[PDB]
């Protein structure tokens, strides 16, 4: 009875399949893939952020030169300068007039915002998708368990053992190269660590926040201070992190395909509705009811009464139930034409009980399996009027 | 309280103790963090 | 304590959202046609504008500023 | 002069290309890919290790039953037992004879060796390969820098800017699924977290060492203690970590293809000699010598004298150097037929100086570019006798 | 007080028992196909072996 089932990847709607175990009473499913969070394999390549030209205070030798050296600070720009007369609080102070030397030095450093407000590149591989699958199973009526997709993983949470996927729809909405910012995720071809052109994205490129080493192509060019005054002309491109916040591109949670949402959290891409998942469950046999205890319902009749050719469960149909015992009777349309809101219907001794459903074909000729009794609920449906609210329960469009 | 060379100190370049370096209009909340050379 | 743009005027058409819209400030609107064809849109809106969106069968979503994202069945 | 060069991926041998900048004197390369450490993108999926059936001490109620409950310990096996008479230091102690109840409970727990002696699964993606490329460049004579492969990354360590790859030979010797053990790495299709059949590999499956939760399919089955004595029959498969150490498979550093070595270190696969790498360098123009300062060497003659048709630099050839000035003269065979040990040859006023080389064609008709002067060093070579030592410098086998 | 070998791993196939097996010591396994064709088997197993 290990109920294999191909199953559409779509998040917010149950998939009430039916266990046709030969010998005992069938049992309905209710498989709602409440989430499709993905979490691909990734690598933190480098944080970037806007620089801060945290200038070390220049040297001023008063009569003669002060040769600079290339200190190992990131992008340590330093250039000796002569021909000053530095006004500092008493007019000038160095008594020479051309031998007055000024050595400006400036290096690039991570902002304090780099720790917290920072873009973040990644080389993104495929990884392994997940889900908090609820099944309000059978008469168990509950399990809300986190699972995987790889087609040999069980998750014995509740009582049922369930194996999912691998899904066929391998579209990772993440591209190979991704930039990430706070919550807005950008599938951007970031240039690389170690290379980013100044002004362009990644002018600062630190491996992480702690990493004292980095790559700072900022085109930081010191110029001589003017007219014998102490200061430090640092001529520099404002960061490619400054832009990339107001001349950027749009976020993947606003431009992705096939229906995904995003988080700066394990780097999941939630709820990506695409393709199917070959899902298979091993039910606990204890949860089964033996066949000789559920009422046999045959010699019945089914008919629509007001079929709504729609998404919400507007389709209805009375069923002239013709039972033997009285009790519950799980139901399902093995044809995917009709999706039913009721998993189970209570029965007195051969009464009648309408259920709700939804279809996509004008003439819904769908079988209905009322606990081992098939029936065609043939009829005709009506279009609605009022179509602006969230996503459907029908999801069965085909040739009609 | 350090004193440095303010760039347009009312008239022109004076040496104000409140000489402004490291202006940071990088947050969002209408706020700027500033450093005077003066230590109030 | 942060921003919020005035609510939209939702208007139905056949697989199409007319939206007479009227913000306070320039608002970046954007959408995601949830087909594997994404077909997104972006436009800062400061001038009030009646816009349009060819919604598909499976759904679209709609982001009136930092107001939360909406979603829509257009069968 | 940004000297693009396709370049074979092979670790322990320089690649002394030649900079043919039009206008100034050429300069030799010496590019030795000292390492090819790989570091693919990976994910720690679960540690495994051998269990320890760290039995909690059973209950013994003396007259009547003690119902057990399913405590949440990993693989918490517990089974009530009656019909005992437990000999404990005074003969039995419970005065009944069948109402004597014994409740055995045992759960699975990580060994103390699990922290330290533990296999380790991974889902392995491709990542990004690296190298500590030495170039004893030109007259610079040194840089030993760590680089990347992605074909826009420079590494300005030394004075030269160098861009490497991407390599064409994307064989990650790691498979998708890998198990890892101490240093021996196994490209094993580990079953998964959460599933591993008892006895088989991964009977214990802990996410990490700290992770108190795990999956312990050990088939732990308690049996009743014998003949009224206190003890705990735990019947259990010795671990699939016990086997997998003496009925395992061989390690990827002993079964890989295309020439790799391995470490339990960043999970690199060193020195994978396969394919080519499109490498391109931007030399410092200061390092160039202008053309009007090196001797012009033309009106020369070249000939082998004892060519060794071999790997070690056994091939030799005098060259009747016909110089103008006297000094150094970088050399290279632009044809890949001949690989030369000498990058540079000193020259007096039109002397003669033999160099060493190695070839693969019986009639080596290779050009030799002695600092802008080509020459065919045609001749014939001799096979050696003594072939059992490490790897060659020739690496140029073709149709001969 | 006497011997006992670790339990087998029963595995189903079509009219066929795969048995991944893993003893402590050399264990004489044997069977009896209950047809009037006996077709028995004997083999001491000390090395773990998947049999059929």
Automatic annotation (TrEMBL), chains A, D:
Subcellular localization, as worded in the UniProt entry: Host cell membrane; Host cytoplasm; Host nucleus; Virion membrane
UniProt subunit comment? The precursor of protein E3/E2 and E1 form a heterodimer shortly after synthesis.
Purpose: Provides the signal sequence for the translocation of the precursor of protein E3/E2 to the host endoplasmic reticulum. Furin-cleaved E3 remains associated with spike glycoprotein E1 and mediates pH protection of the latter during the transport via the secretory pathway. After virion release from the host cell, the assembly protein E3 is gradually released in the extracellular space.
* Descriptive protein name: Structural polyprotein
Q: Which organism is it from?
A: Eastern equine encephalitis virus
Q: Which residues of the full protein are shown?
A: 802 to 1201 of 1242
TrEMBL record, chain C:
According to the UniProt entry, where is the signal peptide?
none
Q: Where in the cell is it found?
A: Host cell membrane; Host cytoplasm; Host nucleus; Virion membrane
Q: Which domain of life is it from?
A: Viruses
This molecule's function is given as:
Provides the signal sequence for the translocation of the precursor of protein E3/E2 to the host endoplasmic reticulum. Furin-cleaved E3 remains associated with spike glycoprotein E1 and mediates pH protection of the latter during the transport via the secretory pathway. After virion release from the host cell, the assembly protein E3 is gradually released in the extracellular space.
Subunit structure, as described in the record: The precursor of protein E3/E2 and E1 form a heterodimer shortly after synthesis.
Q: What is this protein called?
A: Structural polyprotein
- Species of origin reads Eastern equine encephalitis virus (EEEV)
């Amino acid at each position: 009875y290990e109920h294999t089932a191909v199953m559409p990847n779509k998040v917010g709607i149950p998939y009430k399949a039916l266990v046709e175990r030969p010998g005992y009473a069938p049992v309905h499913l209710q498989i709602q893939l409440v989430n499709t969070r993905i979490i691909p394999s990734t690598n933190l390549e480098y944080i970037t952020c806007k620089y801060k030209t945290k200038v070390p205070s220049p040297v001023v030798k008063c009569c003669g030169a002060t040769q600079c050296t290339s200190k190992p600070h990131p992008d340590y720009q330093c250039q000796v300068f002569t021909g000053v007369y530095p006004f500092m609080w008493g007019g000038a102070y160095c008594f020479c007039d051309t031998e007055n030397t000024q050595m400006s030095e400036a290096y690039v450093e991570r902002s304090e915002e780099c720790s917290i407000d920072h873009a973040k590149a990644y080389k993104v591989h495929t990884g392994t998708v997940q889900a908090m699958v609820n099944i309000t199973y059978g008469s168990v009526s509950w399990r809300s368990a986190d699972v995987y997709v790889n087609g040999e993983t069980p998750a014995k949470i509740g009582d049922a053992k369930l194996i999912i996927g691998p899904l066929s729809s391998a579209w990772s909405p993440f591209d190979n190269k991704v930039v990430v910012y706070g919550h807005e995720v950008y599938n951007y071809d970031f240039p690389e660590y170690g290379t980013g052109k100044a002004g362009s994205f990644g002018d600062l490129q630190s491996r992480t926040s702690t990493s004292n080493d980095l790559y700072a192509n900022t085109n930081l060019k010191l110029q001589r201070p003017q007219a014998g005054i102490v200061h430090t002309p640092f001529t520099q491109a404002p960061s490619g992190f400054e832009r990339w916040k107001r001349d950027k591109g749009a976020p993947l949670n606003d431009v992705a395909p096939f229906g995904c949402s995003i988080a700066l959290e394990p780097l999941r891409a939630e709820n990506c509705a695409v393709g199917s998942i070959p899902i298979s469950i091993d039910i606990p046999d204890a949860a089964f009811t033996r066949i000789s205890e559920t009422p046999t319902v045959s010699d019945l009749e089914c008919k629509i009464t007001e079929c709504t050719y729609a998404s919400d469960f507007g389709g209805i149909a009375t069923v002239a139930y013709k039972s033997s015992k009285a009790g519950n009777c799980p139901i399902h349309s093995p044809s995917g034409v009709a999706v039913i809101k009721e998993n189970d219907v209570t029965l007195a001794e051969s009464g009648s009980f309408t259920f709700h459903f939804s279809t996509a074909n004008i003439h819904p000729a769908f079988k209905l399996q009322v606990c081992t009794s098939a029936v065609t609920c043939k009829g005709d449906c009506k279009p609605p009027k009022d179509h602006i609210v969230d996503y459907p329960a029908q999801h069965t469009e085909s040739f009609t | 309280p350090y004193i440095a060379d303010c760039p347009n100190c009312g008239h022109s370049r004076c040496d104000s103790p409140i000489a402004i370096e490291e202006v940071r209009g990088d947050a969002h909340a209408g706020v700027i963090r500033i450093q005077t050379s003066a230590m109030f | 304590i942060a921003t919020l743009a005035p609510e939209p005027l939702v208007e139905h058409k056949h697989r199409t959202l007319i939206l007479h819209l009227h913000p306070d400030h320039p608002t970046l609107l954007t959408t995601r046609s949830l087909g594997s064809d994404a077909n997104p849109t972006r436009q800062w809106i400061e001038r009030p504008t009646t816009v349009n969106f060819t919604v598909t069968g499976e759904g679209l979503e709609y982001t009136w500023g930092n107001h939360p994202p909406k979603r829509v069945w257009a069968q």
